[PDB]
Symmetry: D2
Subunit: 210 residues, 4 copies
Amino acid sequence: MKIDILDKGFVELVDVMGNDLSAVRAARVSFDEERDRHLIEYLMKHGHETPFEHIVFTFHVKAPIFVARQWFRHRIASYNELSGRYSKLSYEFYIPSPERLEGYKTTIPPERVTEKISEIVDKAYRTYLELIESGVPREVARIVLPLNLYTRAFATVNARSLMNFLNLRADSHAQWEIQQYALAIARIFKEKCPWTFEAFLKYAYKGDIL
Amino acid sequence: MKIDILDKGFVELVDVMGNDLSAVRAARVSFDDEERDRHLIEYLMKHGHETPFEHIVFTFHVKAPIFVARQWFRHRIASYNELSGRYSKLSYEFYIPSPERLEGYKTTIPPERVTEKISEIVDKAYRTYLELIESGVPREVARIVLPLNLYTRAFATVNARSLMNFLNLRADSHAQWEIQQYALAIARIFKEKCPWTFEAFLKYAYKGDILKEVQV
Amino acid sequence: MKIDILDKGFVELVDVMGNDLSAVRAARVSFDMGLKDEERDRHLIEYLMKHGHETPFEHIVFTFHVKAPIFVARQWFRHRIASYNELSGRYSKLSYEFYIPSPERLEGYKTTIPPERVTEKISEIVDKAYRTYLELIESGVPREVARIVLPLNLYTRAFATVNARSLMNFLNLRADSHAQWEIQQYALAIARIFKEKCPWTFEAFLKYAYKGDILKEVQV
Amino acid sequence: HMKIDILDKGFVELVDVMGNDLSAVRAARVSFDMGLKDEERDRHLIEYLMKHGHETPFEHIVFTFHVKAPIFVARQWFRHRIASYNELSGRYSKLSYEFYIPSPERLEGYKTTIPPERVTEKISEIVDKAYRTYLELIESGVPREVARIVLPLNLYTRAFATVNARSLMNFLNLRADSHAQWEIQQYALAIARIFKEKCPWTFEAFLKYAYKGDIL
Ligand SMILES: Cc1cc2nc3c(=O)[nH]c(=O)nc-3n(C[C@H](O)[C@H](O)[C@H](O)COP(=O)(O)OP(=O)(O)OC[C@H]3O[C@@H](n4cnc5c(N)ncnc54)[C@H](O)[C@@H]3O)c2cc1C
Ligand SMILES: Cc1cc2nc3c(=O)[nH]c(=O)nc-3n(C[C@H](O)[C@H](O)[C@H](O)COP(=O)(O)OP(=O)(O)OC[C@H]3O[C@@H](n4cnc5c(N)ncnc54)[C@H](O)[C@@H]3O)c2cc1C
Ligand SMILES: Cc1cc2nc3c(=O)[nH]c(=O)nc-3n(C[C@H](O)[C@H](O)[C@H](O)COP(=O)(O)OP(=O)(O)OC[C@H]3O[C@@H](n4cnc5c(N)ncnc54)[C@H](O)[C@@H]3O)c2cc1C
Ligand SMILES: Cc1cc2nc3c(=O)[nH]c(=O)nc-3n(C[C@H](O)[C@H](O)[C@H](O)COP(=O)(O)OP(=O)(O)OC[C@H]3O[C@@H](n4cnc5c(N)ncnc54)[C@H](O)[C@@H]3O)c2cc1C
Ligand SMILES: O=c1ccn([C@H]2C[C@H](O)[C@@H](COP(=O)(O)O)O2)c(=O)[nH]1
Ligand SMILES: O=c1ccn([C@H]2C[C@H](O)[C@@H](COP(=O)(O)O)O2)c(=O)[nH]1
Ligand SMILES: O=c1ccn([C@H]2C[C@H](O)[C@@H](COP(=O)(O)O)O2)c(=O)[nH]1
Ligand SMILES: O=c1ccn([C@H]2C[C@H](O)[C@@H](COP(=O)(O)O)O2)c(=O)[nH]1
């Protein structure tokens, strides 16, 4: 299960432990679909969130660094990222579509903004390559690369922390770019925990876009 | 997978996400080579790179006396749901130490008498408790007369890194004996589900003294 | 500042870092600003509380000294975003101190035996259990074993260091009628100290963010 | 009140502190049912706790720092999850013309086919062209959160950081170390220096008994 985002990003489901019944078992402390769903909706509406900590996901995420800096602020989660200190860094950058500037009345066409973003990326990356080849250590050379460079990370997160993430990122105050990643997270979450996700939306979800 | 502990306790594995390779994929950042993979497990553990191990997660169902659970729930990087005394009527189950538990200390009465003395008050406390329940005292007030050796039950979800920390501290002769026994059972399950992390852990990172002595 | 709770319990404030302005200072870094103004700083607090920006309140930290029955400590220490150090029954000979509810503890429940009888029966097992504990000790039973006969209403003591965001989560859950009465009492006194040290943050919390019921009814 | 300048334009500034060495003694002492004693006993205890890896008592010493750092430093630093951060937002403010230019001497030990000064120059040029593109996009009405994506990782950011002594010592183990990138090591040197000033006994004990790095 993989969902492409932005121009070259994605979120893939790597692994999941448990399902809706995992929260049910924990809440009951032990080990009829209408009784179990009812308990899920009961916990969600009253803010009993701890039973949801026993459903856990691991995602593999390709995201621009500026999205990843916002993402990694969520501290109740586990991350492992590619090191730019050690990997020769890929020619992969997020270039916004022209549609990204809809509703903004701009001096220069959205199409020239795009072009201006990609030119800097191109000159930054080429300066970076000039630096490597002359023997500047990678850890120094990449400091000239722009914030739209793509990075990759594994994110392991339980469903409670995943719901707090969606409260803050599946919402129109979050930067658009991370909203799109948040939508994808929600979709995988829905697939894997339909009852939890459905109760989340009804009783506890604080954002707007979902 | 279920292991009896003490007189009435147990450690039961409810669930696991991942195995040794889940730490490897996370260190490499790759979704999709035994010798090499094992070599890396060893490498991360040798050089203190412990984050990749946070991507293996266990859920245990644990039954233990409250004095043991209070030591255990002090480990905060973990998720707990415990049987509520406020809401459920509590079962006549109490940890009563073996005389084998005190043999090793010089006492002035036979350990048989320690067993009978402990059993005695458990019995009187529990009766007072039931009398209070029956007479209409809410359970959450009636249970405060119950002694610390009352058995409780919890689901614990914990990643392998935090589990290793748990083992450093609880799988060790400095820890109270009762919880050591629970740690041995946690270790055994860990060893079974992640043999490469476990051996690498014992070789490089483990700070305690029992798991190097006592098999599994 | 020391507030007495229950018959022998207390919440004492050991230390505080920062005050309301700590949070303003922290929030202002986002907009390339420092401290700005004595009344613009208060409004920024309301604003943060109103829109759910909780991170700046992490920069206010308290250390409390708390004496409380184990059954209360057990519920309290469930709050994982905090630091605790507790009196150890493995290494210390525990004192004769136990929470004996007063007869008024049973207001609103029909009982079968009078409330002072309930109080009496609680005292009785407490005195039995503690005698045994002492008999066990005298006999050479190590403390870590002897104490397992002691009841849940035994008082214990702990340091708790906890930031204002986490302490607001604690008030959400514990200064509320769904939480057990005894810990409610403790959450009131915690509320009183938060309020004395962080009055702006505290007023804003009650008005915009607080989910419990009792602090809107019960002064301070 | 303390302030230490790091790199060409960065700093570490102590904003506030809660407690001191005795804060840990006090918290530790509660366990044995004791309190503060003489200077000899209390110093001895701090050393004892550090030797045996009893680190919970150090959680009761707290620091607030105000740090100015290039994003590539702050991105590593922010991986330390047991801490609180508030940072300058590229979403909401006009970012300043401030970037870390490595000095010529940063390249000591590497044979370069371009004199270190020209490296320095090349980094300045690219940074300048980026910042000009950023300003031009802002002036033309491109939203700040978008225009800034062209800015490089050597751009200076600002943050407040609140962190307890235990998590501070973990940060020192990992960043006060030659395996860590030079730039973060420098910030770590600043952090350690202030830690030392405010909690001398703890710091000495940490250095002698628990500190895992090589540069302190
Ligand atoms: C629209 C929006 C604009 C924002 N702008 C800014 C900005 O200007 N500056 C900035 O620095 N960041 C900003 N952020 C980041 C945001 O404030 C948090 O850093 C991020 O959302 C993580 O939230 P969290 O702490 O709830 O999640 P996590 O860190 O994953 O924590 C999860 C939950 O655990 C609790 N918690 C965890 N750790 C602690 C702790 N140490 N103390 C107390 N409670 C804790 C909280 O209840 C929290 O909800 C912004 C976020 C969004 C969505
Ligand atoms: C009225 C009420 C009745 C309850 N009855 C029960 C019961 O029957 N059984 C029982 O076991 N317990 C019960 N509790 C305890 C409850 O389940 C919580 O453990 C406790 O209240 C602490 O709440 P917290 O997790 O919000 O606080 P903390 O554990 O301090 O966490 C605070 C915040 O940090 C975040 N957070 C921290 N760690 C994690 C994590 N690992 N994953 C995701 N998010 C995290 C959350 O956002 C949370 O808001 C009860 C509590 C109350 C108030
Ligand atoms: C033999 C022994 C005797 C002990 N006696 C006492 C006693 O007398 N009194 C007492 O109160 N407790 C005592 N304990 C409990 C002990 O102090 C620890 O709280 C417990 O062992 C869990 O330790 P932890 O913090 O490593 O685990 P967790 O809480 O799971 O934390 C795991 C890891 O996360 C980090 N971490 C998590 N939260 C924080 C934080 N808030 N700040 C900084 N770093 C953090 C640490 O690096 C830690 O190793 C005893 C434990 C043992 C094993
Ligand atoms: C020289 C070096 C090279 C590195 N290269 C890489 C790389 O390629 N990729 C990469 O992603 N990062 C890398 N890092 C970052 C590293 O993986 C950690 O994210 C960072 O060092 C934070 O360490 P920490 O998690 O121990 O500290 P914190 O995250 O603050 O945690 C402090 C302590 O609390 C405990 N703890 C906190 N949260 C949890 C949890 N959820 N589960 C279990 N235990 C917990 C641990 O005991 C930990 O030691 C590198 C770091 C260094 C120093
Ligand atoms: O020494 C390092 C190397 C990597 N990382 C983490 C921080 C980033 O989130 C990610 C990539 O860092 P760079 O290697 O790109 O600096 O890994 C560190 O914290 N320290
Ligand atoms: O109101 C409550 C009820 C329970 N618990 C937690 C504490 C224990 O870990 C467990 C059982 O508590 P009692 O219900 O036995 O008090 O759940 C609370 O934190 N608050
Ligand atoms: O070996 C120990 C000793 C103490 N504690 C913690 C748990 C309780 O919060 C408090 C009291 O524990 P006892 O000494 O009563 O077991 O200290 C432990 O976690 N492990
Ligand atoms: O919507 C936001 C805005 C900011 N931040 C955090 C992430 C960074 O650590 C810091 C600045 O991010 P930017 O505003 O530069 O994205 O604040 C977020 O997490 N989400």
